[PDB]
Amino acid sequence: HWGYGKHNGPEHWHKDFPIAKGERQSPVDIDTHTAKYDPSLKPLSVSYDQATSLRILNNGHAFNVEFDDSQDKAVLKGGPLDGTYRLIQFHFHWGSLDGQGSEHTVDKKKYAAELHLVHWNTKYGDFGKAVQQPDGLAALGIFLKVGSAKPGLQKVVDVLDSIKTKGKSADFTNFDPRGLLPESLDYWTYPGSLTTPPLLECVTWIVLKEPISVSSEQVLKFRKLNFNGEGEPEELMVDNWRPAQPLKNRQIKASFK
Ligand SMILES: [Zn+2]
């Protein structure tokens, strides 16, 4: 099935998921000189104070930190969004080396990694229903560069040893995702898709301009994870990113001047 390997990687996905060649696929390159400031964007609201993390799972293509989304706790609203979007999980994409790993690019620059906080529109009742709607999901994307350590990431990095292989999970309660945000909430936004199969075109992307810094030691530990299951030939979980897709008939809007 699909993956990031030599023979099942992003260039192959269209065979099982024809929408891979669709009109609003993600990620994209953000051309900073062409993105236009949009005065109509309302302020972004990230309300994570009541966030309830539950578990961390290696799903064979990334690790997801999963949240309790049975009630309105951690929510994203404002910005380009109408209504309320509930946090369900976050995960990362990263490279084999610091010079690649992000999905979105900025003037073709690739960051070492990219964090995705995934939220679904409560007007559709559940995540499964939401992904079938053009405005079903809101994904907050945050770039990672290598430099100083990110204290708020360390609890994540330290549990990775316990979920090395596909299908392993671990209890992961009381994790505060506010510790992963940069100082500024300046952002770019555009209509897009899931970046993994089924690649559904249901996502409003909100990509923050300010990267967070993580340490070499921290990202090194991401790269010790495995795509494979327990006991199988070791394939390091690295370069689990989809490259930039054609922008087509879309405009990227900036929240800032
Ligand atoms: Zn992602």
Swiss-Prot record:
Effect on the protein upon substituting residue 62 to F: Reduced activity
Segments crossing the lipid bilayer: none
Annotated effect of mutating residue 118 to A/G/I/L/S: Reduced CO(2) hydrase and p-nitrophenyl acetate esterase activities
Protein name (record): Carbonic anhydrase 2
Stretches assigned to coiled coil: none
SUPFAM superfamilies xref list: Carbonic anhydrase
Gene3D superfamilies (alphabetical): Alpha carbonic anhydrase
Mutagenesis / variant outcome for changing residue 198 to A: Normal CO(2) hydrase activity, but impaired stability
Required co-factors: Zn(2+); Co(2+)
Family: Belongs to the alpha-carbonic anhydrase family.
Origin species: Homo sapiens (Human)
Main location: cytoplasm
Keywords, alphabetical: Acetylation, Cell membrane, Cytoplasm, Disease variant, Lyase, Membrane, Metal-binding, Osteopetrosis, Phosphoprotein, Zinc
Top-level EC class as recorded in UniProt: lyase
Chain positions with Phosphoserine modification: 162, 169
Gene that encodes the chain: CA2
UniProt-annotated location(s): Cytoplasm; Cell membrane
